[PDB]
Amino acid sequence: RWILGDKFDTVFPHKGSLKVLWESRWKFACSKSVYPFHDGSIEDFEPIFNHLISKNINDAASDEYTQAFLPTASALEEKAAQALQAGKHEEASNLLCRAAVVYRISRFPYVDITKPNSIKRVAFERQKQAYLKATSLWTQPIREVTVPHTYRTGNDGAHIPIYIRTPAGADQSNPVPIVLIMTGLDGYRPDNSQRTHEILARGWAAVVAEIPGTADCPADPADPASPDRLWDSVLSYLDQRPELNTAKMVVWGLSAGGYYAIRAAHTHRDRLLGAIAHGPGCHYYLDPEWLAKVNDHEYPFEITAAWATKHGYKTVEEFVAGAQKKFSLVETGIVDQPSCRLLLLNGVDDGVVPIEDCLVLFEHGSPKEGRFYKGLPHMGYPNSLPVSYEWLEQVLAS
């Protein structure tokens, strides 16, 4: 029934097995310092996973998982403090970034927005402190701004914390183009260092914002219109920043963020030059037949429980029963209007969100742009990264 084909029915070997996840995929991702271990070091993680494997800890959602990481993170923070005392700012920055990645993996896959005392929430708070300390030592530092949510209605929160990083020389005399990153289910505002490096290297500002039902996003997760109000507040803030050119602005949605990049490409088409949706869902990812097997594929742990919470559902049963008709950009008719240029990037063999969620968008509204990677799973990494920048260069060309 799916382009994924027979692999749809494959039970992936790492399912319910942190040992297999580590030994077959994550050890190598960590070794290579690529997602989700970007900015990280194997020396920090090998001892932690050896501990988790020896204790037969498999449930990432358990406190036994999260607490295994915390002493290592603390040790790196103290090493950074010692480095900083000796005036070794580069070493201190690198150590704090390493602590941030340890916190990041400790809170994989999802900070429960309904559990403010959860150890994963504690880990995320410590990650943000360590990350801001690390990036304060950068020549072009990442600054946090709490954007007042002027467009808030109903159950929306009051505050939108975003990261902003501006290139050397960014001035009101010649305002710079903006790339706004919309983060995902397991990646939040501190998880995008290399993207900010690449954006700044091309003379652009990087802005990072979390999506509804995640991290510190104030958007009502249960209101499908809540992201529209969120981007109204964020874009209106960026409009008033003298050194940022909102006339040359592209949105970049990562994984769960892809949905929001697609949506904003339609809802905010007159305020964006372009959108990139990286491994996006928009319709078929919420199909009950797809949700029936989504936990058996390449995502490191069970995803449906996290998805239920992120979509504002009190139970997984309600999510599976109701989500598609409520949130599908196809079912709700969001796709039946024009959009700014929209680049769709994914692996054809995505088992997290179906490649059909890219393909369906060519049958609605404006022409879409796409590159889909044969035989590759969710996000199509590493192949899908370089083309992102080639496209951004074309769209933001002077």
Question: Could you list the active site residues?
Answer: 255, 350, 378
Please, are residues 273 and 246 in contact by the beta-carbon 8 Å criterion? no
Q: Report the C-alpha gap between 317 and 294 in whole angstroms.
A: 15
Closest CA to 193 of 161, 165, 214: 165
Please, are residues 390 and 369 in contact by the beta-carbon 8 Å criterion? no
Query: For 167-255, where are the alpha helices, taking DSSP H only?
Result: 193-201, 226-240
Q: Report the C-alpha gap between 354 and 345 in whole angstroms.
A: 12
**What are the Cα distances from residue 220, in Å, to 106, 153, 223, 230?**
26, 9, 5, 10
Locate 261 and state its tokens.
Answer: 């990049």
**DSSP string for residues in 194-217:** HHHHHHHHTT-EEEEEPPTTSTT-
Closest CA to 161 of 140, 178, 142: 142
Residue linked to tokens 């020896």: 54
How many other CB atoms are found less than 10 A from the CB of residue 333? 11
Locate 201 and state its tokens.
Answer: 């290297």
